[PDB]
């Protein structure tokens, strides 16, 4: 549970001194691009149900063993729980790119859900591939310009792809 600003504050307090000037210029540029970070976050947020349905749509086209009887996502209840797990992961990705820090995504999902999927018998590979495909579709939905002023949102493509790869690797 950290912001960008609280991250700089905690680092400056662990140093024990005041915040240096170059960190303040970095935070000024962050305050200039923080809206840039988040208009896109808004265009990421508005299409979330389409994102998770298309992600499960491609995943269950790709791995039909999960839909097959005896598969892990075969049962209707389990399949609803699977879509719920995916939507939760996407929501915490949107939270982490809202606050601009991966510590919220770490705090809320990552440390426990790998052990949860081991204990449940959930294959971590399929949900890792699903989070990767969902992230690819999310950047693909975010990057296209439709009635919006031209912006630089590419570094933010850097950050969003970082968050999605962190989620996919912490899932494993």
């Amino acid at each position: 549970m950290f912001d960008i600003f609280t991250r700089v504050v905690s680092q400056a307090d662990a140093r024990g001194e005041f915040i240096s000037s170059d960190k303040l210029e970095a935070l000024k540029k962050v305050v200039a691009e923080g809206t840039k970070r988040s208009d896109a976050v808004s265009r990421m947020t508005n299409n979330a149900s389409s994102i998770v349905t298309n992600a499960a749509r491609q995943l269950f086209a790709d791995q039909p063993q999960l839909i097959a009887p005896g598969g892990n996502a075969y049962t209707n209840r389990r399949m609803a729980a699977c879509l719920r797990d995916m939507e939760i992961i996407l929501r915490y990705v949107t939270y982490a790119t809202f606050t601009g820090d991966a510590s919220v995504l770490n705090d809320r999902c990552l440390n426990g859900l790998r052990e949860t999927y081991v204990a449940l018998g959930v294959p971590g590979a399929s949900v890792a591939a699903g989070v990767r495909a969902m992230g690819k579709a999310a950047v693909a939905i975010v990057m296209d310009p439709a009635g919006v002023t031209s912006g630089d949102c590419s570094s933010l493509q850097q950050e969003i792809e970082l968050y999605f790869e962190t989620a996919a690797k912490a899932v494993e």
């Binding site: 549970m1 705090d107 809320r108 440390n111 426990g112």
Partner: protein, 289 residues
Amino acid sequence: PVTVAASRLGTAAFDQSPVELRANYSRDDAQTVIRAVYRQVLGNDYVMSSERLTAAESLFTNGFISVRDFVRAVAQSELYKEKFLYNNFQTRVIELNFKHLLGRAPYDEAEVIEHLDRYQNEGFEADINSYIDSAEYTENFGDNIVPYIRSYVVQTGHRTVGFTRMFSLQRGYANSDRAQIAGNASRLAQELARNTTSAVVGPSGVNEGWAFRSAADDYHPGQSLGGSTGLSADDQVVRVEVAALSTPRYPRIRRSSRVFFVPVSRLSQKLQEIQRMGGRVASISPAGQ
């Protein structure tokens, strides 16, 4: 869930969602959860800083102690027994434990029978453990969730009696549990052993008829047997409960708050005569016919 009358029932105070303690909570989050636990278990009674039980409280913020176990620790603490067990009758103690630890009021008299036997057999500590370690508790909220009142919701397991008895147990957000109008006398046990619930009353700036209570002598069913046999009219009977008959003095009124069974045809005259007395109508409910 009671939205249209939430202003007048005081539900809109408690409309907010249940607080949740997370996997790795921050340092400040534990203090907010601690504030909610102290409020709900001690019934909005404020804790002074000297009585804060910081020794058991720090273990919560470490994470040694689950939120359910923190609720158990504050329930079995000595200051709890001084606030709630000691100056109360044991059915009132049982009702307060049902309010604090689960949220809902007890439904029947057989519910009181088990806990009352358990107190005498094993002590208040095992009684508290049986309140907290119930299937009802664990089902309705998790161990991490601070307990909250769940009455306005059906939630697939509530009887209707629980919603009406909860309003007798809780009188607004500002109200403190130790300090109520009934005082030491249990509101629910007289209702409970006859298995009959009363029409609920709100609190004041919402509605000035609070002042009404069902006194010990006169128990009124809320149902008119006559369907105006006694009232000798063909119209339907209502039940009108008035809280403060001030304008007639001592020789004229003996009790400031009483109920009347009025036919609808002469209801308006009854409202006028009762309002001229300075009387405040708590509630009008249909009685019969």
